[PDB]
Paper text:
The first crystal structure of a channelrhodopsin has been solved for a chimera between Channelrhodopsin-1 and Channelrhodopsin-2 from C. reinhardtii commonly known as C1C2.4 This chimera with transmembrane helices (TM) 1–5 from ChR1 and 6–7 from ChR2 is more stable in detergent than the parental ChRs and provided the first invaluable insight into the overall architecture of the central ion conducting core. It shares the prototypical seven-transmembrane helical fold of microbial ion pumps and human G protein-coupled receptors. A first constriction of the putative channel, called the central gate which is composed of residues Glu129, Asn297 and Ser102, is found close to the retinal Schiff base and its counterion residues Glu162 and Asp292 (Channelrhodopsin-2 numbering can be obtained by subtracting 39 from the C1C2 residue numbers).
For our room temperature analysis of light-induced conformational changes in C1C2 we purified recombinant C1C2 from insect cells and grew crystals in lipidic mesophases following established conditions and subjected them to serial synchrotron crystallography at the Swiss Light Source, where they diffracted with anisotropic resolution up to 2.6 Å. To elucidate the conformational changes required to fully open the channel, we performed atomistic molecular dynamics (MD) simulations starting from the light-activated structure. Even though the central gate and extracellular vestibule in the light-activated structure were more open compared to the dark-state structure, the changes were not sufficient to allow K+ permeation.
Numbering used by the authors:
A (entry chain A), B (entry chain A): 50 to 111, 118 to 295, 296A, 297 to 327, 331 to 352
Write the structure that this text describes.
């Protein structure tokens, strides 16, 4: 540690004395991060993630910028974890006694908006983004900022900022859901609709797990230890980023093959909220005005 | 303060003893935030900003969501400053001795992307955003994340993260410049082109001042004190947000009046990098294919 770890209790445990060496001191910081079993598990999941993220980068290496940016950051993340995981400021040890994993929240700020940009162009064919895309990004940034602030805070201040994060988060989840519904009815009828369905399940489950891990972790009720929280977070990271990004590359190849073999043939379908989506079709026998009541 | 402020030096200044009351302690945290003159100046500029931001909200209150979101956050910001400016986590007092103004960086994360979204639709007429818009947002988020990490860090770690912020920042500034060039040649020939020119000056000067205030502040070489840094930051805040947002509302009204009186009549002008922009014109005697060599 690069904070004070050696001290003496004096006067029946009522006074703590430390070397006057310029280092900060706090008992709360010295609480254990967890068991050796938790530590072993965390280093394994990290290695798996560093390696798999590096494989994904090379694999994608065989437009497309979103999968690479996230996979690059995940890799960079491990080297910092690997060398300085518990060094400030990968973990912030603050005057109120909290341990805040800035690396995680910073990583979310780097990667989550890019995932949402990817989500807004699942097929990869669009060159533009609507107004709703922008709201998705702004709501998500706020979620992380409130969540980070909550983690840095204590008591009632933590609770309030968490709840604003929850309000921002619901708005994010709701609009993400809207995007996936449009995407499902946009992509061709076969395999493309299977992949999109898989991504929705992956997305809502993995992203939905995050507020839960927060509540359980040191940032909430301290059920999970620091290592415990790391293991959980790396799991849902693999889901939310690596696996989801894999599917996204796969989905985009499938969309590309469809347009190469069949060309870009569109049919307008309307979904009655009442939304309209231009579905990709396979042959020119369809170019009509189809609908679908929900 | 809610950290330890009372201590005794023992053994010829080599041992510090504190009450064992659970509070964290560090000498670095107790350094003064600055002179009383600096404090007075900071409270004045904050009040000016709280009031003026509230005026802007009501004033805009007489599409348009970007001016309100930023002005709302600025207002909320002051109430937190007003009640808990130097309470954790508005300022983070970390184990490495740094004081990091999380409120500022968090505020930047909330407001700067929205300013850039506004910038990407200065006229307010567009319903879509290109790929380049998305890069603008992603580069800017990275800047803040690296800058925040640099502020939280020390020594060579601070320097590296600052430089990545600088690389991200240049990419942001460059693309912002691209947007303003397109915007200038898009808006009508008269007053609209004056306002856009004003915004470019405001934008690059106020945003450009931020890395400079960083280098001078406690986050860098400690030339400026904490209060000193606050005063500077509130000034360029008024420029980057309040004044710029004012012009943006004004610019959008002017664009709206043009389309109401004259309708939406466009002419394609091409700018030889070679870029094409559809300029708004006043009468149907222009609908041609004009160009302009740079
Ligand atoms: C994400 C979109 C779908 C929403 C589903 C969300 C997942 C579960 C959240 C649940 C209830 C909120 C719980 C609020 C309590 C949190 C307060 C806290 O963290 O505890 C602080 C306290 O000071 C320490 O003792
Ligand atoms: C923003 C786009 C246009 C670019 C214009 C930028 C404005 C000026 C930046 C300049 C040089 C960079 C200076 C790099 C030195 C910073 C390192 C530092 O902060 O000092 C840490 C040290 O450890 C404490 O003693
Ligand atoms: C680690 C195994 C995961 C926890 C198993 C329960 C246990 O006690 O295992 C401890 C053993 O000494 C180690 O494998
Ligand atoms: C394989 C090594 C992985 C190093 C990280 C990225 C490669 C991204 C290319 C841009 C270079 C950035 C490297 C960096 O450290 O920033
Ligand atoms: C997002 C980037 C995050 C964490 C910043 C990287 C972690 C910085 C820690 C570097 C450090 O100070 O390590 C000193 C070493 O422990 C001497 O023994
Ligand atoms: C807490 C919920 C607040 C949700 C904050 C998310 C705001 C998203 C947004 O700004 O959307 C603007 C919309 O287009 C307006 O016309
Ligand atoms: C405050 C005035 C800004 C600094 C003026 C220089 C000065 O010394 O003024 C101190 C005086 O006591 C107070 O006005
Ligand atoms: C005038 C009071 C200003 C209070 C802040 C915002 C109004 C924004 C309307 C949404 C309500 C959010 C209020 C909040 O505190 O979050
Ligand atoms: C972005 C939001 C930021 C700062 C969070 C708000 C600042 C939280 C400080 C509240 C607090 O703990 O105040 C205790 C008071 O000082 C008892 O005397
Ligand atoms: C450090 C400079 C790195 C700049 C990081 C900014 C990346 C912006 C971006 O992702 O743009 C993607 C582009 O569209 C690709 O096709
Ligand atoms: C790669 C990392 C990802 C996809 C992280 C996602 C994180 C979230 C969806 C976090 C959500 C939260 C809330 C819904 C409420 C406030 C607490 C948070 C930040 C954990
Ligand atoms: C309302 C707040 C605004 C507009 C803040 C803008 C901040 C910046 C443009 C900061 C830029 C930085 C760099 C260019 C390099 C790294 C250090 C920063 C974060 C100060």
């Amino acid at each position: 540690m690069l904070f004070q770890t050696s001290y003496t209790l004096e006067n029946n445990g009522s006074v703590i004395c430390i070397p006057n060496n310029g280092q900060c001191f706090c008992l709360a910081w010295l609480k254990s991060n967890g068991t050796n079993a938790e530590k072993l598990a965390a280093n394994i999941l990290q290695w798996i993630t560093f390696a798999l993220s590096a494989l994904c980068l090379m694999f994608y290496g065989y437009c497309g910028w979103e999968e690479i940016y996230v996979a690059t950051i995940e890799m960079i993340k491990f080297i910092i974890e690997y060398f300085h995981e518990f060094d400030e400021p990968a973990v912030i040890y603050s005057s109120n006694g909290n341990k805040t994993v800035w690396l995680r929240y910073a990583e979310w700020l780097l990667t989550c908006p890019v995932i949402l940009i990817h989500l807004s162009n699942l097929t990869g064919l669009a060159n533009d983004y609507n107004k709703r895309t922008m709201g998705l990004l702004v709501s998500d940034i706020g979620t992380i900022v409130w969540g980070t602030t909550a983690a840095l805070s204590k008591g009632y201040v933590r609770v309030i900022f968490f709840l604003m994060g929850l309000c921002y988060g619901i708005y994010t989840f709701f609009n993400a859901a809207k995007v996936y519904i449009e995407a499902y009815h946009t992509v061709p009828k076969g395999r493309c609709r299977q992949v999109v369905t898989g991504m929705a399940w992956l997305f809502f489950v993995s992203w939905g797990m995050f507020p839960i891990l927060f509540i359980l972790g040191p940032e909430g009720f301290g059920v999970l230890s620091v290592y415990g929280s790391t293991v959980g977070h790396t799991i849902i990271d693999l889901m939310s980023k690596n696996c989801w990004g894999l599917l996204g590359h796969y989905l985009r190849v499938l969309i590309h093959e469809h347009i190469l073999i069949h060309g870009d043939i569109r049919k307008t379908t309307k979904l009655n909220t009442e939304i309209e989506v231009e579905t990709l079709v396979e042959d020119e026998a369809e170019a009509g005005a189809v609908s679908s009541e929900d």
